[PDB]
Amino acid sequence: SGNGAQGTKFRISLGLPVGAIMNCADNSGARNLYIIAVKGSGSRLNRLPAASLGDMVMATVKKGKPELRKKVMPAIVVRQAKSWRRRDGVFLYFEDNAGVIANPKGEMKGSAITGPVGKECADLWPRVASNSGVVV
């Protein structure tokens, strides 16, 4: 997760190390989200911090509105291509990785989301869920 989130989040498999680029699912004007940090992440020598579903990450926009680039911003992960296993026994996975831009609290910068959203994420950030189409 991150913080400013409502609730807890049973561990899901990590899909996105630092340096990963994922799609941006909102109307914000950004095409990419480039992962440079993960708000959960503890410490191990040589270990890459890596996010999963519903994690707040620090990002930059590598492509999109110039007024949105060259600066680091919070981001929330709504889809991952990396397989993970819900407690109900089912291994699942999306078609892409995507995040939505957000502020340190959780409030999305934009007000829309294209594509489906993992419920773990949606159940963790109200505003993401508020602005979400199909969930899961």
């Binding site: 026994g89 089912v90 699942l92 999306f94 489906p116 199909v134």
Partner: protein, 52 residues
Amino acid sequence: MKVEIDSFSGAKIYPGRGTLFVRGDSKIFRFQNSKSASLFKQRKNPRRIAWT
């Protein structure tokens, strides 16, 4: 507890089995195993696969 069906082979999927895929739209797919999921990713057609 529900049994699902392999959405490519029509096979029964009991709890824990195979994988679920969530395509771009929101079309959810199900495979009882890696074999039908490989065939699916290969853009095969179930109607032409004699055992489905």
